[PDB]
Amino acid sequence: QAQRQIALIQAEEREVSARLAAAETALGESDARRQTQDAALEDNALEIDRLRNALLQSD
Amino acid sequence: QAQRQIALIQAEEREVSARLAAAETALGESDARRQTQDAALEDNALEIDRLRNALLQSDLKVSSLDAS
Amino acid sequence: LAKSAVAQEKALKRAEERAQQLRARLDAMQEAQDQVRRDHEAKIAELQATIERLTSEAALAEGALEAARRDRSRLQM
Amino acid sequence: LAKSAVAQEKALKRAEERAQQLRARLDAMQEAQDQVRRDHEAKIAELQATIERLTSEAALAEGALEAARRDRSRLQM
Amino acid sequence: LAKSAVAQEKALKRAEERAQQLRARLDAMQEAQDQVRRDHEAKIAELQATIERLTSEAALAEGALEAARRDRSRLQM
Amino acid sequence: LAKSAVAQEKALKRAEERAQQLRARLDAMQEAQDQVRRDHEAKIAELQATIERLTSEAALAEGALEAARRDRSRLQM
Amino acid sequence: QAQRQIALIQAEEREVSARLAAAETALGESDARRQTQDAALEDNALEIDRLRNALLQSD
Amino acid sequence: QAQRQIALIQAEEREVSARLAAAETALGESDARRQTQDAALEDNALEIDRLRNALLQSDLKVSSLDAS
Amino acid sequence: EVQLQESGGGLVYDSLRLSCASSRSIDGINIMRWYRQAPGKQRGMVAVVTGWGSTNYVDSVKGRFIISRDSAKDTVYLQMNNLKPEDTAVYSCNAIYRGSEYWGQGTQVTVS
Amino acid sequence: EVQLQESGGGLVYDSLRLSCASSRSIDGINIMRWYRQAPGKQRGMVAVVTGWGSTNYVDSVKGRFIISRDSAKDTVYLQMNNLKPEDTAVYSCNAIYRGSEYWGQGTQVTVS
Amino acid sequence: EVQLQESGGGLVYDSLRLSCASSRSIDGINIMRWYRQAPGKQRGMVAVVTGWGSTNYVDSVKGRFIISRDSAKDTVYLQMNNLKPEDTAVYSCNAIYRGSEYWGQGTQVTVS
Amino acid sequence: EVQLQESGGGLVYDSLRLSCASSRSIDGINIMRWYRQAPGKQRGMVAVVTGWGSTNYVDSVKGRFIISRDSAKDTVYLQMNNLKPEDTAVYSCNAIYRGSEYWGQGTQVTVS
């Protein structure tokens, strides 16, 4: 029965390590890009806010 | 020893509902918010183009009229 | 497409560090065979000799020392 | 430049399988050591045991060839 | 038969010194194989790697650097 | 005692063949080294030579790939 | 031709070493025993020389 | 080198007519002298026994006569 | 000098081989290799093997062209499988003994 | 525990064998050996072999009795050749696993 | 792991020298080579030394560079004289141990 | 070649000790053993130690001798107490390296 509990412990930890490895790399970069995409899109979000005034001045 | 490998299993199961789940629960956070900003970028592009082109559409009167 | 072009440029540069970072552990732990087991094979050979001589030494010590001894103690005859 | 991301998409993809493929060999080499690390635990004992009661026969067999060898001197001389 | 009996007694004692005296040179010069040639086998393996990589390094250096270079200098077309 | 020389004649004879037999193996092991000591003289050269004009091709082949590569910068930029 | 002269040099020296080895061991001990056999036999050579007087005194 | 192995051969042939022969010539010395003393030992034993036994043969008169 | 009287190629569309035989020196084999060339251009190698079972390929001939050894005959086996249209070329095997390189004929392989 | 169901002997005057078979442990073979004994006396070995091809003999059985291994069946081969008159005896093979020694029957060889 | 160490930077209008030392795995060196890098451009060999110290270079420096070794101290040297302002590049010595390559920091040589 | 070194001589009517040290090939020791020699008589084992330090002796000294090792210093020890004047002999420690045996000078132990 010692081999029985052991048989899972390498089996489980490998599945455990996989989800520790995968989720950590899954979350990280996509988090880095999301904040940039927020920065990327919200800075030229005022671009429409600047031009809507520029449209109304002359129209 | 065999029982201290038995003790690990519960704590190992504690670690997955712990950090393991925290990572999973954070996954739903990003993709949900990603779709909000991703879909908005199309809409924000849609809102920009109508008045960026109208800028060109409406301004054109600045020069043509001045001939008069 | 400046931020998209730049993004992939910094994107690749980390996975190519993992390329070394995962062949770093591989190079080390692979050396854990080339010497640890290879000498571990030698000690078996070293311990192997003693099972060759305790048989040779007892070869004279069991037969010859009893082919004549119990012959010599045949005083019962 | 417009397609230059397309080329840089594949290095972002190819380097991913070099991460995927390589860790598999890291998976294998671990039990290529651990299972052997259970084999070189039994071999020493199973080999050392067949010696640890070989000296106990190299000696006790001489007990008959020394406790009874003290008798020959009574008559040989 | 005292001098004849004694003569053989001192006679054997020198040839049994040659028994060691001729297995002395044998034990030494036989060790001149177990390390001198065995490591001499290793240096061949050590030098053997460089003929594996100069082919691998030139594998990219000869084909790829000429599959596109002479393609690039097709300005004659 | 009368026959005791007869027994001691054979050790004077047996130790003689142990001298005779053993020197024969000393005869053999000498050319078991010398002839091999001519084999491990040619192998190094025949192996090192096939490298000493491999770097002379790893370089001169790049001469075409560097003396002609200076021309692409005139038009690519 | 270098191998030709060499072919004899190991061939000759081995035959040479054999007769250096054999003759040296052949001569030596037989010389040691001969001087002893001289000593062994010449000391009781006077044994007859002593008794020939002892015979003549009484006879 | 090959010629200095050639030079050795003559000197090697000089060494055999030298010490090599000195040992051979000494071999005839011992066996010749060995046979002289070996054969003599039989003769010296032959010369001893005739007068060692005559010692017993002739002395016997010392005691038997004294009875008279 | 070797006589690498090579052969095995063809001029077709399904499964081919490049077998470079021997004439002397049964596995006196140090570095030995192959070359191809396209007309109007100079030479180039295809795949190279070394007497230690180590084999490496240039990028193109991967997955379709296979090189393997056979010391029992001294005839390097360079199988031509999955002959793609680009594989049209002129080929020739190679070897190096004593330092002085040696060459042979080779043949013309044209598959489209 | 092994079952060394040994056999092969005989009771004659020309060429015999002592073959000690196996029951388990195909070359789980550490030190393993043979014993003989003459009636009215206790036991004694004849020849011993070890799993490393090293073989040694007691003085008597030299030149006439030969011991050799066969791992493909786990049946030590102890050939009985040139059966001299003294070779009359009672024999039995031996082995040692886990430390705890094991024995069998053996047979009676009587050649005069 | 193994380490390298470069040296030899300098400018003139003409006296100059380079050196590339190592502190570990000393003389355990099969083929090792030298490189130069054009700014913002690729990288290629310039000079090499080997086990037997044979002499051969890249065609650009025939009659220009002389390269020599010390087995003990592990610092190979090159002779740079009669420079032409067009030889300037970024240099980084090279070495291959056990079949694996090993680069160092890298330096430049400029004349102008 | 390898060397040994004995020690431990002494007399009483009762306190006594023995030691057998070595200066080379330290701890490179498989089975090594101890002996005693009766004057003008033969030689035989008395006590042994091995790789695992297992305890076993000759029947004459069951409950009489205690033997113990130091792996580092290479000097095995024996416990000699409650002596009987009939144990006197000539002692010489033993060791077998690489399968070959190696004797030393030899000493005696006397009580009377």
Residue G28 one-letter amino acid: G
Say how many CA atoms lie within 13 Å of J11 toward its Cβ. 3
Q: What is the CA radius of gyration of chain E?
A: 34
A14 at D interface, C-beta within 8 A = yes
Alpha-carbon gap, residue L80 to F55, rounded angstroms = 73
Q: For residue J36, count CB atoms less than 10 angstroms from its CB and return exposed for 0-12, middle for 13-18, buried for 19 or more.
A: buried
A27 at B interface, C-beta within 8 A = yes
Interchain contact, F47 vs I30, CB within 8 Å: yes
Answer yes or no: are the C-beta atoms of L34 and L93 closer than 8 Å.
Answer: yes
C21 at D interface, C-beta within 8 A = no
Q: Which residues of J touch C52 (CB under 8 A)?
A: 50, 52, 54, 56
Cβ neighbours around J70 below 10 Å, total: 11
- Count chain F–chain G contacts defined by CB atoms under 8 A: 3
Pair of tokens at residue E50: 């460089």
Answer yes or no: are the C-beta atoms of K108 and K41 closer than 8 Å.
Answer: no
Alpha-carbon gap, residue L18 to L16, rounded angstroms = 7
Breaks (C-N over 2.5 A) in chain I follow: 13
Interchain contact, K50 vs F52, CB within 8 Å: yes
Q: How far apart are the two ends of chain A, measured CA to CA in Å?
A: 85
Alpha-carbon gap, residue I28 to I51, rounded angstroms = 9
Q: Report resolution (Å) to 1 decimal.
A: 4.8
D53 at J interface, C-beta within 8 A = yes
Distance from CA of I101 to the nearest CA of F (A): 10
Domains and CATH numbers, chain J: 15-109 (2.60.40.10)
Residue F3 one-letter amino acid: K
Q: Which technique was the structure solved with, according to the deposited record?
A: cryo-EM
Alpha-carbon gap, residue G21 to G23, rounded angstroms = 6
Cα–Cα nearest to K4, from K57, K83, K74, K60 = K74
Interchain contact, J58 vs C55, CB within 8 Å: no
Alpha-carbon gap, residue B7 to B15, rounded angstroms = 13
Question: Given E44, E50, E73, which is nearest F68 (Cβ)?
Answer: E73
The region that residue J50 occupies, defined by phi over 0 for left and psi between -120 and 50 for alpha, beta otherwise, is beta
Q: Which residues of G touch F27 (CB under 8 A)?
A: 14
**Coil vs helix vs strand at I17:** strand
Describe the strand order of the beta sheet including K65-68 as a list of residue ranges.
K5-7, K19-21, K75-80, K65-68
- Name the H helices within F4-69: 4-52, 55-67
- What phi and psi values does residue C17 have, to the nearest 5 degrees? -75, -40
Alpha-carbon gap, residue J70 to J29, rounded angstroms = 11
Pair of tokens at residue H44: 């010296």
Q: For residue C31, count CB atoms less than 10 angstroms from its CB and return exposed for 0-12, middle for 13-18, buried for 19 or more.
A: exposed
The region that residue H64 occupies, defined by phi over 0 for left and psi between -120 and 50 for alpha, beta otherwise, is alpha
Q: Which residues pair with L65 in a beta bridge?
A: L80
Q: For residue E19, give the chain F residue with the closest CA.
A: F19
Pair of tokens at residue D43: 């071999």
Alpha-carbon gap, residue B33 to B36, rounded angstroms = 5
Pair of tokens at residue L103: 């004797």
Residue count of chain B: 68
Cα–Cα nearest to J30, from J104, J108, J100 = J100
Interface residue of A8, A9, A31 to substitute, partner B, most B CBs within 10 Å: A9
Describe the strand order of the beta sheet including L65-68 as a list of residue ranges.
L5-7, L19-21, L75-80, L65-68
- What phi and psi values does residue I54 have, to the nearest 5 degrees? -70, 130
Cβ neighbours around J109 below 10 Å, total: 20
Q: Which residues make Cβ contacts (< 8 Å) with residue B1, sequence separation at least 6? A: A2
Q: Which residues make Cβ contacts (< 8 Å) with residue J54, sequence separation at least 6? A: C52, C55
Listed as own residue / partner, the contacts of C67-70 with beta carbons closer than 8 Å and 24 or more positions apart are C67/J59, C67/J60, C69/D65, C69/D68, C69/D69, C70/J41
Pair of tokens at residue A25: 């790399």
Answer yes or no: are the C-beta atoms of D63 and C69 closer than 8 Å.
Answer: no
- What phi and psi values does residue J45 have, to the nearest 5 degrees? -85, 165
Residue count of chain J: 112
CA H8, H11, H15, H16 torsion-angle sign: positive
Q: Which residues of K touch E (CB under 8 A)?
A: 28, 30-31, 51, 96, 98-101
Touch test E–H: 3 Cβ pairs or more under 8 Å: no
Pair of tokens at residue J53: 């091809």
**Coil vs helix vs strand at D16:** helix
Alpha-carbon separation of residue H35 from H32, H38, H43 (angstroms): 5, 5, 12
The helix, strand and coil proportions of chain G, stated in percent and rounded to the nearest 5, come to 95, 0, 5
Answer yes or no: are the C-beta atoms of I100 and I84 closer than 8 Å.
Answer: no
Q: Which residues make Cβ contacts (< 8 Å) with residue C61, sequence separation at least 6? A: D58, D61, D62
- Name the H helices within C1-77: 2-34, 36-59, 65-67, 69-72
Q: Which residues of D touch C1 (CB under 8 A)?
A: 1-2, 5
The helix, strand and coil proportions of chain L, stated in percent and rounded to the nearest 5, come to 5, 40, 55
Local structure of residue I5 (DSSP, 8 states): -
Listed as own residue / partner, the contacts of J48-53 with beta carbons closer than 8 Å and 24 or more positions apart are J48/C55, J48/C59, J49/J76, J50/C51, J50/C52, J50/C55, J51/J27, J52/C48, J52/C51, J52/C52
* DSSP string computed for chain J: ------B-------EEEEEE--SS-TT--SSEEEEEE-TTS-EEEEEEE-TTS-EEE-STTTTTEEEE--TTTT-EEEEEES--GGG-EEEEEEEESSS-EEE----EE---
D45 at J interface, C-beta within 8 A = no
